[PDB]
Symmetry: D2
Subunit: 497 residues, 4 copies
């Protein structure tokens, strides 16, 4: 009854997956911890099994990663970029089947599963050039006969903990950047996307082995909170990149700070869209729909609060309701499907509780609010009106497709309301007003790390640094000078007189 | 009795100091907390009194600073730079008497007291140009009809906690950079340099008020651990820059992380000089003497470990012994005095404690080791041979002029020994070997934030970022792109189609 | 009968000016060339005399500057910045009399003459910080054991030729940046502003002399076409910064290219303002007025073409005609005066010639067009309608207050009409359309070096690079990385293995 | 009789070459000009024929490229990078045969022909990442309610004239960077490498066609000085990149300056290696041989002057003699060979004449100096000792493998001797002395664009900017911010208040 044993799913074997797969890689494949089965969220069928990491697997892997660092750190950065280039090519050759696996194990629709692999490919190609660019300025010393140089060196071992909802590209951003910066990596992915983690690691392992490099440069220890906690407490993990819930990330941040390590935290969001009276409503409505219900509301940048000018509130809500009723629901790998299941049954339960709480706090469900009666974890995408902007349920991140809608009148109050929550990830305003747009970007505007105009809260590109502020944790991934978080700066003065 | 009442110290009134001074400034001067008297370490006599902040003083000050931020953040950065330029000129007009105060209340010699004020003046003049430069790239979006912009905005209120040993310039680095970046500032200095804090704040307050700006832009709340703990726990303090001991800084870092705030930590040092067999000994001997005995060994960057190759160990120790005997001792504020008192009677006792522990662990005092028979807190600068490099007292940071001396044979082991301590602030090698120098600067070299060649561990310049790694806390101040720590990055996409 | 011998002009002596002045400075003062008298354009009265450079004067000065370079280039950049900071302060002390001199000898109103000196002060204060910043990256080499470093060094002697209309700040921009970059300078100002050149040089020489530096670091050789032609052919002049007409600038550019020198060319402008139908007309009209009529239309950035959407063409022209009639005319130094004289008698003849050609080519003069019947070189600011956008006089840069007004219908045509002239200095559109503004900034938009929105074609700030494209010459001054034009880049690889 | 018609050279057909080839590409292939036959310099046998561009072909092509630009400049830069990425891949697929063609038609050995194609592949992969990074800063305005933005836009059409000795990578450098910067390209290669130019253009044309882009984005017009002069005078060519002789480059620069165009000049070199008394001779000897004899002494960066300290002069010369003797001669496309022919018969006359002038000048041929007695253009690599550094034949660039050896004693004189020639391309010292190295990199050191330490004058990597000073022309290609030469800067002020 395992999906991998059905001919309909024989393509899983093109990723080198079988019934039971080793979930530890450090040059060798292993796994002496508990064997986990992962399940397809569209039908609750089991796919295949992964042998997770014991404590002894973890300990051996960290040691092998740190020995491998001695070799890797001596490789010139541009030659490390060539390795990353070859990783991108190897992902390229498996983009369709790996994208299908993302749809199957995680449950986002196919164009997004494939899109996620493509973005990993693209960050690899970007990192190739960046590997010839990382560094600091040589500055003029104020003293005769002295040179003044800013040097950047790898931090060493970069632990990477990733979440279920982007099970390929978050790791990929961290991996590609950490690698060209001279670090080795230890990945612990979400347990419910273990096959995805294993499949990606197989692809990278083959590149490293073909180049006669130690496999531990990109190590894998599949596991749950125990492995993640060990990494947070582990002084040999020089940088811990964590993507997950604010609640867990706060504890990881504390554990890393207690040992004077470095952390990079990419936590929850409670992202607002604001539609002013002059907004192009044929941009607002489809943008709100996609930002709120894309990936069944399970992006960290998912729109969860919609503020509408009172003059257009009713019209936007009515047009949003009609658009919701037209959303094509089905298996995430099927053509024309735009909306798949929630990732787990626990997520369905949390969705139901939020909807209940929203009614108890005085909200009105104007669309959805129910669990769909069908196989898998499907819930109706939901719209709630009538709550105050400071309703407790609206200040909570519920990782489900629920959109809280609010009226406003003036710019100043609704900029404050965007900013009042604890999260600080993404934000967008819809307006044509030149002044309002620059005030939004300015010091009295949005306090988030992603600040958008006439486009949804999701959809960032790799060219810029990605991450948020306040309880979103402050880390940055991908573009701009985000690479500096993966290295250590030294200020070096050479007296040559 | 109080030195400020004696005729020979009448120059203190040029700084606006009186017998009892208000230690809270927020646009108004006050202080309803505990009155503290600061003492002169050269003669153990009381100088004058400061009324410190009560809890209600702190609360009112924070609220006034955040109201002032609404005005200050709307001033264009180049116009903020103009205020910082005038702060620089106002320090210029007081440099001699302010430096004399640093020498009097803190105990460092006059050229370093004046030097501290000069460096605050220089960072102000630097910040003026920087104020027309801070910002991020406009990047090419992958999507037509979209702009992609990296914006930087002030974080808000920047709390600044400083230490006794650099009572002017540390605050000055943080103040000048935070100011041009659009932040307001709240200062809590060391209680034993309270007069210095008040005198500096008097100079800044006049500039602000003369420019019709609210004085809370640069607030002062003199106090000890309780005010410092309130700042680290206060959600209204968006960035806390802390300079101090590792033990206190670790608790400050954890408190700030608990609330998802930002911290900038500049902690202790255990700085090493390494002298290879090919070193120029006429550079080594004076550099080691200045780095070890300067400020009576009370710099963060003070050299406390001296590694000498076997072949030259005895000669260097002998030349250092002869050099130590030549130091001219006296009152620190007198020109041409080169060695002053330790900061407190406690520090004298801890000097004796460390010397005793060094002898217990097998070391030999080859010079000094005793208190000097004179008024004040004067001790002999001390040299200790024969310890093992991992001797417990050597891995400790003792804020005293004690130089632990070790032998070595090969490069690889002595690089490791540099790196084996918990601190990671400054480091220097003395060598002519081209390959050895770049290896020292490389991924297998010094793990410190300051990596120097043929000059001492101390005396860095503002053009570079100043700070350390590991238990030194990771923060950076002053130069390079250190301004980015005082601001929040946003990645901004404008769909204009 | 010279103004400098009249009591009401005794303030000229505060600049060190006498009845006859030396116009060569190379550490010593002199001048054996022809004596020139400069005249106040407000009354055609002679001010005072300046002895210009002979050929021997030029030869001696170039040789002393190149000797001074050997000292100057050895001075660390931040120390060079400290000199420039002192130049800034010395200008501050003389801002009122120096600005009055700009008004007296050149003819612009007092607020702009003072404002020109303030801008030189500001670029000095900017340069101070820049002097701790110039340099290039240290890059990761692809080869193990290699360092790859981009170095920047001074070019040597920077010759600076400047125009009459900005007789202070153009020199100041070049001087402050060239100086911090380790170059020595040689200035040949416009002959009709010789007294301004002497007075600026007196202020700088006293600073150099007070710092015990060779005065030839900032040398002066007053003269006309012969000295400037000599600098353009002089292989000893490593970079020639030329600010002036396109016709002369083209011959300078060729002479420099002939000898494989470097040139920085800041040439003519034919700047357009475009006002779209949705523009705030309460911004358009006063912006158009100040852009076309400011400095009697003698700025390189003066608006000489005004494109107005046909829907609003009549109303905008009517309001502009009414605003031109409310302009206060008088002596440039007198209060509330906004419009002064043209610079020379020839410029008045140029103005009348251009008006007749405009009417010959089918234009209608709807305001002004005549000389003013009063002493000095006063002409009426002039508005001409009815020319086709491609009239020859409309593509010519007449340095007089003439505004050619055109209608338009669509964005693509008017953008083309902006770009169709041979100049490419400044441009401005007035609109609220978010898409239009960013198309105006993009690859199908303005082709000029200064591309403005909702402010006139003038008023640039020092933080950006200032220059033009096409026949404007391509040079850049002041901000961004313009300093690179004053230095030479080297790509340096150190094999340390 | 044509090599392409002999079955042994059938592999030429894998590049799409035939007996007679079209030398014009603009989306279609043609050529109405004179038909040239190119010859293999290893045997002087004809390879194949190319129909060059008539004047009318040139006009048609320019008009098509400028129409293609309106499409290309609208494509977002990252998507332009994706095209360049695919160009790199398509070159990858043909690296062996294309490298073999470079050996056959130009005459360098196989590893360098392959390596030249590999370098083009590498610059493409670099440009992919760069295409997401180009741009300028958003700066803080001094005026409230204003944004200040630096914009970069393509210049339009980039004309590229290249030389025979690097017939692939020089074009590649200019093409990859011009393309991501939004320009279209028109290429005129050296007549004697017409087949290489056609073969490269076939590879790129396929990629443009497969992506449904106009092929005129990468236009080709094969021709001689007539076509090159037309490009130099054509106002439709916004940037002319010229690599070639100093004599021709000087005329090109003047023609472009005449029309206020942009030029990027990469001209001749007279590169020196300086070996100091402390140098590692195990490094000096093979580095001198490689730098002097690589590509038969036909690189712009070829070492042509070798200064040796008196102490080690004879030993280094004697060691070079033995090294030169191990140099293996043969057909350069055979993987055995280390030394191929000169490019032309005229080149051999140059070799002979120079060897004769050197002998008449008082130098001794201690090795080589004669024509090899075999088919092709083979000359013995040559070492000349005894001349004085200012001898006329040593200051002229002869494009043949002649190495002039000179003695010296002091650092100051020999730095001067390095800088005394007209060319300013590459330079190298061999030494272990720390101060001498940084002095060499400083304002009193080497005046060249490339300044190397303990490596040859040749073999730069793509990470840095490539180019020289003085009569080398001042252009820069490939790395750092050289991309700015392919774009136009605008400083943009937006008043949104
Ligand atoms: N890295 C640097 O830039 C730098 C510079 C100077 C000094 N230092 C280090 O500073 C130390 C100087 O000794 P010190 O006694 O002044 O340090 P300290 O930790 O005792 O006190 C420094 C500051 O922290 C305050 N403070 C004390 N307890 C606090 C608490 N619980 N919560 C918040 N604030 C508290 C103090 O009142 C004081 O202002 C040395 O260890 C030195 O190496 C580092």
């Amino acid at each position: 009854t395992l999906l991998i044993n059905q001919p309909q799913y024989a393509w899983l074997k093109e990723l080198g997956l079988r019934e039971e797969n080793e979930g530890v890689y450090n040059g060798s494949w292993g796994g002496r911890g508990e064997v986990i089965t992962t399940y397809c969220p569209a039908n609750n069928e089991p796919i295949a099994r992964v042998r997770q990491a014991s404590v002894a697997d973890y300990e051996e892997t960290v040691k092998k990663a740190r020995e491998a660092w001695k070799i890797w750190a001596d490789i010139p950065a541009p030659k490390r970029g060539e390795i990353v280039r070859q990783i991108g090519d190897a992902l390229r050759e498996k983009i369709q089947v790996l994208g299908s696996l993302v749809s199957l194990e995680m449950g986002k629709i196919l164009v997004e599963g494939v899109g996620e692999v493509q973005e990993y490919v693209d960050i690899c190609d970007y990192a190739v050039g960046l590997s010839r660019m990382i560094g600091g300025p040589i500055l003029p010393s104020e003293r005769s006969g002295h040179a003044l140089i800013e040097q950047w060196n790898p931090v060493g071992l970069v632990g990477i903990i990733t979440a279920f909802n982007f099970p390929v590209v978050v790791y990929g951003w961290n991996n590609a950047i950490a690698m060209i910066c001279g670090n080795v990596c230890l990945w612990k992915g979400a347990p419910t996307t273990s096959l995805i983690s294993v499949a990606v690691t197989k692809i990278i392992a083959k590149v490293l082995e073909d180049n006669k490099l130690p496999g531990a440069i990109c190590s894998l220890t599949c596991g749950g909170a125990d492995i993640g906690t060990a990494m947070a407490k582990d002084e040999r993990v020089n940088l811990l990149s964590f993507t997950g819930s604010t609640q867990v990330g706060k504890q990881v941040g504390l554990m890393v700070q207690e040992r004077f390590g470095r952390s990079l935290l990419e936590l929850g969001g409670n992202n607002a869209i604001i539609a002013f009276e002059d907004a192009d409503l044929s941009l607002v409505v489809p943008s709100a729909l996609f930002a709120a219900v894309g990936t069944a509301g399970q992006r960290c940048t998912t729109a969860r609060r919609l503020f509408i000018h009172e003059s257009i509130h009713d019209e936007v809500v009515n047009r949003l309701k009609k658009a919701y009723a037209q959303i094509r629901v089905g298996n995430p790998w099927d053509p024309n499907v735009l909306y798949g299941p929630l990732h787990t049954k626990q997520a369905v339960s949390m969705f139901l509780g939020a909807v209940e709480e929203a009614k108890k706090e005085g909200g009105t469900v104007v669309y959805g609010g129910k669990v769909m009666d069908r196989p898998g974890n499907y819930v109706e995408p939901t719209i709630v009106t009538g709550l105050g902007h400071d309703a407790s349920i609206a200040h909570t991140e519920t990782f489900a497709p629920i959109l809280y809608v609010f009226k406003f009148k003036n710019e100043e109050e609704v900029f404050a309301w965007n900013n009042e929550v604890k999260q600080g990830l993404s934000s967008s305003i819809f307006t044509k007003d030149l002044g309002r747009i620059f005030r939004w970007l300015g010091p009295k505007g949005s306090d988030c790390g992603i600040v958008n105009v006439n486009i949804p809260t999701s959809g960032a590109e790799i060219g810029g640094a990605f991450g948020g502020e306040k309880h979103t944790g402050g880390g940055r991934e991908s573009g701009s000078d985000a690479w500096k978080q993966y290295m250590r700066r030294s200020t070096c003065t050479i007296n040559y007189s």
